Each structure stands twice: as structure tokens, then as C-alpha cells.
Amino acid sequence: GMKLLLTRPEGKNAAMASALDALAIPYLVEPLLSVEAAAVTQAQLDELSRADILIFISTSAVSFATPWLKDQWPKATYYAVGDATADALALQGITAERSPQATEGLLTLPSLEQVSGKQIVIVRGKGGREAMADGLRLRGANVSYLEVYQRACPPLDAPASVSRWQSFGIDTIVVTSGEVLENLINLVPKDSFAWLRDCHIIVPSARVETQARKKGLRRVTNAGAANQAAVLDALGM
């Protein structure tokens, strides 16, 4: 019967693996999305000593900043978005005020109301918009970013991976975002597109189903959400 490929980031596949263990459904785990270290310059490290405020937007921001900042954390006021982020800072010896947990919640904190001329550093992943930080710019803060990680597809030997999947008998692939789907389609060589096109692809949304179908994939089931209950239901469990 069905044999599944699970593709969430390293560390995020155990719950689904366990459900499949219970059901005796064969599967392989191959993360197709990762966070990895981004470049930081000496000038950026040096500038951090003039920061008034550091804002951490994720647990990855803490984890990937730690190699740069361990035992030399700036003497600043710290903020954290989400409990996991706060816990991570606490483990590094830092007490950070939390989003009271959306990033934009920070713009309701009394302590960030008056920030004109303050040096504020947003520790975050590379790319995308940061509307909360745009609010601080609007308030007159001198805002910069310390982009300590970036999203990537993990380094994979694509031929060796696709071969393993085919030999194993993978026929169902679960993707939990449009980015993962793009990484999958770009990883699979042109002459194996036919094989991928014949796999049953479970996607998290109708938007991503459209993305998959606009790429020529034909056996695509929208689960409605990326969560495990929704995905299992999509597979008939």
C-alpha cells in the first residue's frame, strides 16, 4: 500500500512518524526545508555595542545568534516574540519582555512607545517584511537588522535521494508549505518529473494545490491545513 515521504524541518517529523509507526505505514523522513546560518560581519558585531534595544522574533533568531553573541551579549533591553523565544533567551542568561504572541503585539507595549533616536536591532531570518519594525521606524527609531539565519533546502545529493525514495517505494509525499513544494519540484530532475507527477502529493491549502497544479502535478489532495489531523484525514486516517 502507501509509503510516505515526510519533509518537515529536522526535528519536526516525530509526531507524524509515530502515527505512521502505529499504523504500520512505511515511511522515510527527509527534511526539504531548513534554517541555516547567514553571514554576519565584524562591522555588525561592532555596531551591536551601540544598541539600546534588541528584538528577537523567533527561536531560530536566538539559536543562530548565540554563536556570535555568547558571553558578549549587548547591554540592551531585550524583547522576545513567543514563549519559545523567551525561553531560549532565558537559557542564555537574558530576561526579555514578551509580545503580550504575534510580532505586531510589541507595538502595544508601553516600553516601546517612546523610541525616537533609539538604536534598535531586530534579530531575525533573512528576507521578507517586518511590519512591526516598520512601526518602530515610523516612531523615529534607528532600526537595523541582524539576519542570523536564512531558509534553505538542506544540502542533498538529489539523485541519490530520489533513487532511495523510488527503491523504497515512496508513493505519497506530504508537503506542509508552498516553499517545501517548490524545493521538492526543484530538487527532482527533469526526467524524474513523471515519477513525481505520479506520486500523491498532500498539500496544506488550496492555494498550494493551485501552485502544484500550475506546475503540472495532477494527484494532489488539499488537506486544508498543515497539521497532522488534517493530513491524516487527507490520507484516509
Cβ(34)–Cβ(152) below 8 Å: yes
Q: How far apart are CA 192 and CA 38, in angstroms?
A: 32
Contact by Cβ (8 Å): 204, 176: yes
d(CA 89, CA 79): 9
Distance CA 94, CA 225 (A): 35
> 50 pairs with which residues across the strands?
none
Judge contact between 37 and 126, C-beta under 8 A: no
Please state, in angstroms and rounded to a whole number, the distance separating the CA atoms of residues 148 and 40: 7
Q: Which residues contact 41 (CB under 8 A, 6 or more apart)?
A: none
**DSSP conformation letters of 26-79:** -EEE--S-EEEE----HHHHHHHTT-SEEEE-SHHHHHHHHHHHTT---SSEEE
Q: Which experimental method was this entry solved with?
A: X-ray
- How do the domains of the chain map onto residue ranges? 1-34+154-236, 35-153
On the question of a common fold for 1-34+154-236 and 35-153, the answer reads: yes
CATH classification for the domain delimited by 1-34+154-236, as one of 3.40.50.300, 1.10.3720.10, 3.40.50.10090, 3.40.50.720? 3.40.50.10090
Q: Could you tell me the fold of the domain covering 35-153?
A: Rossmann fold (3.40.50)
> Resolution limit in angstroms?
1.6
CB-based contacts of 18: which residues, under 8 Å, 6+ apart?
Answer: none
| Separation of alpha carbons 237 and 59, rounded Å | 32
Burial of 126 (0-12, 13-18, 19+ CB in 10 A): middle
The CA distance from 146 to 133, in Å, is: 12
